[PDB]
Design a protein around this ligand. Structure first.
Ligand SMILES: *C/C=C(\C)CC/C=C(\C)CCC=C(C)C
Length: 544
């Protein structure tokens, strides 16, 4: 994707914030990961020039300009521009939204970092009231800000002043706090503490008055943005692309419209709702496909059908596990298991009925010649019983010899062989070539054969009774095995992010202590203690 000019992403019309549904349409189509650079500043600050230079070349709100990334292959550079800041009831909301949506946050101001510049940057002192970190109900929620806030860049335009001092050390010294307790001191320290604690990284660029040395001060700012601005990522390594950014815009803007707080965790869970249900359908579609191309529905045994389900079920779970995240209480995985169980019971009852048709059909083919040779009285005769017993067994052999009958072959036949039991005993009793005590022996031999066969059917209806419950356990163990490995990867990734956060907090805490601010160091030490406790957490399995 390569838009020629910026399009309004969020409009500030009527005191309302609305996401331009056209802008979301373009976002949904972008599949590549995104580096989101937000350029923020009061109106007529010169942001439009940085916006055009990063791209490679109204009415209030946030404007978006997505061009391909110049120095990262296969990535999209998303430029966000705040239009109309300081002209005012939604100004602070636009500042907050630019923090939530960007991976690098560029604040642009004119002149130097004095009292007027800090007063104009009053939005940072309201982020505690505009942004929420955690969804769930003694440290502040804003202590989590540093773990997902963007890098901070403060560009100073028309910086007519001599630094020896680097632009970065100028920022560092400017953010040093004042000692004292009067409120001009607390007013002085509040935006500086906010910048130092909420953003993981700080950078400063100074620009002369606009020129070939204004052009390569700009060119070095762009190259720093191109080399150092990271992919927009949500907690858990989720790389934000088009549809995922659209998810964020909608969640945050709808939360503001409702009078609620845009909450980073709520946005992640709302996005997980979308992709997890899509993961379930992708999992099912893979199951149906690998199954329809692997089962021919007179299965020889039941275990042949259960093994095809088991192997198809394993891959479907693999599909879902790969495409899912934040499956709180495993609701979507349990939903996938329910649908896979429903599919398994449908393949089974269609399996047995394809067998109860292949065999019931071949009874009318094999045994109806004999059935109507009995009709014409062909066996009603001296010696007719032995001729009948012999031909019935030849037919029974021809029945067992047919290729693939299924799991119903014995039940269908033994039901028919007893359908004609009295018809056979009539042939036996009227045969005049047989002893009447040899008639005795044969009535015993037949009812022993019937009782033996009628017991092995009940023995098989038990073996299949228990193959089903047995496979129900491997299914469960397969879900358990794959979820366990998924939950460990997520924990290892969450721990990697928390160690990074722990290092940034420890660095800022003792820096505060070194500068002599025991109160602020004490607060940060509690944030560290709260974070180290959280790092020891392990998510549980919802079994019942
Ligand atoms: C550690 C996780 C456990 C013990 C739960 C794993 C089970 C599911 C997820 C549910 C899927 C399995 C069935 C519905 C039988």
């Amino acid at each position: 994707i390569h838009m020629t000019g910026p399009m309004c992403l969020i409009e500030n019309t009527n005191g309302r914030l609305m996401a331009n549904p056209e802008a979301l349409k373009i976002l949904s189509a972008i599949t590549q990961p995104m580096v989101v650079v937000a350029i923020v500043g009061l109106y007529r600050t010169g942001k439009s020039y940085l916006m055009n230079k990063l791209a490679g070349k109204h009415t209030k709100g946030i404007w978006m300009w997505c061009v391909p990334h110049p120095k990262k292959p296969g990535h999209i550079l998303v430029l966000l521009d705040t239009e109309g800041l300081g002209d005012n009831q939604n100004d602070s909301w636009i500042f907050a939204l630019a923090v939530l949506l960007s991976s690098t946050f560029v604040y642009n101001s004119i002149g130097t970092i004095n009292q007027q510049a800090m007063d104009q940057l009053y939005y940072v002192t309201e982020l505690t009231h505009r942004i929420r970190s955690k969804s769930s109900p003694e440290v502040e929620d804003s202590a989590d800000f540093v773990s997902f806030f963007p890098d901070f860049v403060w560009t100073l335009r028309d910086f007519s002043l001599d630094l020896p001092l680097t632009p970065d050390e100028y920022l560092t010294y400017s953010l040093k706090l004042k000692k004292g307790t009067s409120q001009k001191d607390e007013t002085f320290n509040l935006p500086r503490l906010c910048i130092r604690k909420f953003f993981p990284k700080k950078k400063c660029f100074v620009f002369d008055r606009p020129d070939p040395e204004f052009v390569q001060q700009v060119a070095d700012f762009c190259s720093y943005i191109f080399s150092n601005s990271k992919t927009k990522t949500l907690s858990g390594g989720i790389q934000v692309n088009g549809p995922r950014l659209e998810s964020l815009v909608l969640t945050y803007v709808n939360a503001i419209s409702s009078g609620d707080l845009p909450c980073m965790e709520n946005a992640v869970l709302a996005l997980a709702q979308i992709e997890n249900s899509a993961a379930v359908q992708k999992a099912i579609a893979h199951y149906e496909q690998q199954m329809g191309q692997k089962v021919q529905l007179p299965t020889e045994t039941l275990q042949e059908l259960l093994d095809l389900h088991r192997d198809s079920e394993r891959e479907a779970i693999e599909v879902f596990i790969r495409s899912s995240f934040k499956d709180v209480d495993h609701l979507f995985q349990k939903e996938l298991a329910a649908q896979l169980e429903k599919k398994r019971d449908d393949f089974c009852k269609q399996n047995q009925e394809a067998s109860s048709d292949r065999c019931s059909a071949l009874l009318q083919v094999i045994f109806s010649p004999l059935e109507e040779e009995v009709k014409a009285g062909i066996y009603s005769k001296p010696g007719g019983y032995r001729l009948f017993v012999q031909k019935l067994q030849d037919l029974k052999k021809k029945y067992y010899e047919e290729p693939r009958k299924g799991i119903q072959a014995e039940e269908i036949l033994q039901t028919y062989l007893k359908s004609k039991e009295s018809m056979t005993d009539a042939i036996l009793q009227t045969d005049q070539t047989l002893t009447e005590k040899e008639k005795e022996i044969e009535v015993e031999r037949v009812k022993a054969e019937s009782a033996q066969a009628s017991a092995k059917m009940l023995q098989e209806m038990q073996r299949k009774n228990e193959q089903m419950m047995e496979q129900k356990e491997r299914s469960y163990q397969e879900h358990l095995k794959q979820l366990t490995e998924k939950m460990e990867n997520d924990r290892v990734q969450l721990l990697k992010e928390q160690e990074r956060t722990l290092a940034l907090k420890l660095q800022e805490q003792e820096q505060l202590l070194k500068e002599g601010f025991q109160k602020e160091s004490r607060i940060m030490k509690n944030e560290i203690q709260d974070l180290q406790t959280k790092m020891r957490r392990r998510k549980a399995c919802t079994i019942s």
